Design an enzyme around this catalytic site. Structure first.
Site, mmCIF file in Angstrom:
data_model
loop_
_atom_site.group_PDB
_atom_site.id
_atom_site.type_symbol
_atom_site.label_atom_id
_atom_site.label_comp_id
_atom_site.label_asym_id
_atom_site.label_seq_id
_atom_site.Cartn_x
_atom_site.Cartn_y
_atom_site.Cartn_z
ATOM 1 N N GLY A 42 91.072 50.368 108.375
ATOM 2 C CA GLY A 42 92.154 51.335 108.369
ATOM 3 C C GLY A 42 92.446 51.837 106.968
ATOM 4 N N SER A 61 95.054 51.318 105.095
ATOM 5 C CA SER A 61 95.786 50.383 104.242
ATOM 6 C C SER A 61 94.994 49.107 103.978
ATOM 7 C CB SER A 61 97.140 50.038 104.860
ATOM 8 O OG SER A 61 98.023 51.146 104.783
ATOM 9 N N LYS A 66 90.394 45.078 108.570
ATOM 10 C CA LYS A 66 90.476 43.887 109.405
ATOM 11 C C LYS A 66 89.109 43.559 109.990
ATOM 12 C CE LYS A 66 93.293 46.507 110.368
ATOM 13 N NZ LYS A 66 93.659 47.792 109.706
ATOM 14 N N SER A 113 88.877 56.341 116.001
ATOM 15 C CA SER A 113 88.074 55.292 116.625
ATOM 16 C C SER A 113 88.873 54.003 116.812
ATOM 17 C CB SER A 113 86.816 55.017 115.797
ATOM 18 O OG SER A 113 87.151 54.567 114.496
ATOM 19 N N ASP A 114 89.836 53.768 115.925
ATOM 20 C CA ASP A 114 90.690 52.593 116.034
ATOM 21 C C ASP A 114 91.629 52.726 117.232
ATOM 22 O OD1 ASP A 114 92.033 54.705 114.826
ATOM 23 O OD2 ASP A 114 93.325 53.393 113.628
ATOM 24 N N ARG A 115 92.116 53.941 117.467
ATOM 25 C CA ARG A 115 92.954 54.212 118.628
ATOM 26 C C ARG A 115 92.128 54.075 119.900
ATOM 27 N NH1 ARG A 115 96.062 59.790 117.891
ATOM 28 N NH2 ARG A 115 97.500 58.835 119.400
HETATM 29 C C1 PAU Z 1 96.015 58.359 112.943
HETATM 30 C C2 PAU Z 1 95.237 57.238 112.258
HETATM 31 C C3 PAU Z 1 95.230 57.458 110.745
HETATM 32 C C4 PAU Z 1 95.922 55.908 112.559
HETATM 33 O O1 PAU Z 1 95.068 54.860 112.188
HETATM 34 C C5 PAU Z 1 93.803 57.175 112.792
HETATM 35 O O2 PAU Z 1 93.825 56.767 114.132
HETATM 36 C C6 PAU Z 1 93.097 58.531 112.711
HETATM 37 O O3 PAU Z 1 92.565 58.864 111.707
HETATM 38 N N1 PAU Z 1 93.059 59.406 113.871
HETATM 39 C C7 PAU Z 1 92.376 60.684 113.789
HETATM 40 C C8 PAU Z 1 93.264 61.800 114.336
HETATM 41 C C9 PAU Z 1 93.696 61.491 115.769
HETATM 42 O O4 PAU Z 1 93.609 60.319 116.222
HETATM 43 O O5 PAU Z 1 94.143 62.414 116.497
#
Ligand code: PAU
Ligand code: AMP
Ligand code: PAU
Lengths: 253, 256
Positions: free
Chosen positions: A8, A10, A13, A101-103
């Site tokens: 991420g 910050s 992990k 991708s984390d989401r």
């Molecule tokens: C929003 C963050 C920075 C949160 O980690 C990350 O999930 C991200 O870069 N998302 C890309 C834009 C989006 O998810 O719509």
């Protein structure tokens, strides 16, 4: 035996999951720009491969590769991207790849962790992200806001008279205070940003419940969840391994 | 006969007004900072004031620029920089350290006390930061809170994340206009726009309901600032729009 990496903005992990996707080893390290040290992968077995989620940019991508090449030379690695559909979850984004991708991994983890439930996923990192996930796996949409730390940091650097407070300091301040309304600057600042988080989530949840005319479990993830949960007047569930659990499922398939 | 020049210098813009009588705002205007390429105010049609009353929360550099602008346009003009007080013009400062309260918040509190006689208030002011103040009908400022503004929230997301762009309020508002706005969004710029906006509205609604529950009495929500229009749409609770709170407060101070 798969190594999983959640990079991420910050910090980075990581986790090591076995055949049953049990996270036998976990850890985290900061970025080089923040004086972050390297991860201790000394007493760690050689994984069959590495699965990476990186929303922190190209430099972080390069550093991760160097770390892997130093510890396990020539280790197979995959950087995941958000997909239109994967592991029981469908992507409701107009452009699926645009989703972090984390989401995406977190959604896959939440779908498995709470089968047969509509969910509101609140993740607290550099940014606070919200996702609406139906029981059938439909990720129908989301919201993005700055995290607690980022909000206060922004106040400190973009004004002349406001102090820069860490979450550690801010959390301690609110502990000794008696409510959103404060009678001093650092507490007003700390409470103002915190109730921006709580207010955002609470409004979103009631909006989601009213829209789906059905029960919705509010899931919280991240370090700031502790402080945000204390301001919530609605029920909530804690689960801090959604992203790493999702990576395990992606790696398994 | 002597008019008063009132300066409200914030961290984003510098607002001004020429005042008659007790608090009659005759002329008004605003201009940006030097660091943002902001121009100088058009004071070319204004008469010489009796003096200038200044609220500044934007530091010494801005304070020096304001002094220079005044010295150039009206040489020898008396000037007064205000500071938050324990009590003034019917308002009582509930801050532990009264002087730490932003002078703009103090002036706004003084303006709101006069503008809404006999009413309990929640004052929402939208600038670089979003500030709330709880004000009793008797004039007791009992407490408040500070959050980053709509623009600042999105700027923070833009600079501290690798994959999020910086959106202006013009861009965000354009993307959220009409049926575009939803409780949840299916694309990055709108998710970004809505998330920060709903954080603003969510903050206000939470604080307002808590205040009403606390005081167990009617509380008028009052909105001030530029972003108020967008935040208002996101609000489900009633609200009053009153932008001249700060300038009116300065005028009442200058009149006294
Ligand atoms: C929003 C963050 C920075 C949160 O980690 C990350 O999930 C991200 O870069 N998302 C890309 C834009 C989006 O998810 O719509
Ligand atoms: N809120 C205020 N209202 C009226 N006069 C003020 C205010 N704050 C400061 N002053 C005046 O500004 C001058 C300098 O203020 P200070 O630097 O606080 O001593 C003195 O003449 C004060 O009386
Ligand atoms: C909060 C701001 C930045 C809003 O302009 C300003 O009022 C300020 O600098 N206040 C100082 C701290 C306080 O008012 O508690």
């Amino acid at each position: 035996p798969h190594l999983l990496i959640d990079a991420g903005n910050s910090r980075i992990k990581w986790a090591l999951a076995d055949a049953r996707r049990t996270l036998v080893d976990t850890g985290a390290f900061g970025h080089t720009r923040d004086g972050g040290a390297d991860p201790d992968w000394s007493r760690l077995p050689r994984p069959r491969g590495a699965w990476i989620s990186n929303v922190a940019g190209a430099d972080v991508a390069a550093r991760i590769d160097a770390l892997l090449d130093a510890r396990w030379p020539g280790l197979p690695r995959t950087t995941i991207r958000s997909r239109p559909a994967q592991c029981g979850v469908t992507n409701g984004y107009t452009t699926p790849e645009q989703l972090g991708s984390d989401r995406w991994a977190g959604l896959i983890g939440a779908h498995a962790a709470f089968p047969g439930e509509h969910l509101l996923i609140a993740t607290f990192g550099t940014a606070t992200t919200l996702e609406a996930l139906r029981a059938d796996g439909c990720f129908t949409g989301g919201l993005i806001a700055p995290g607690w730390a980022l909000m206060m940091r922004a106040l400190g650097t973009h004004t002349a008279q406001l102090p820069t407070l860490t979450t550690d300091i801010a959390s301690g301040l609110l502990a000794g205070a008696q409510e959103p309304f404060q009678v001093d600057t650092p507490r007003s600042l700390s409470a103002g940003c915190l109730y921006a988080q709580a207010g955002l989530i609470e409004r979103a949840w009631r909006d989601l419940v009213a829209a789906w005319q059905a029960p919705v479990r509010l899931v919280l993830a991240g370090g700031a969840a502790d402080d945000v949960a204390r301001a919530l007047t609605i029920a909530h569930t804690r689960h801090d391994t959604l992203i790493l659990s999702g990576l395990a499922l992606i790696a398994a398939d």
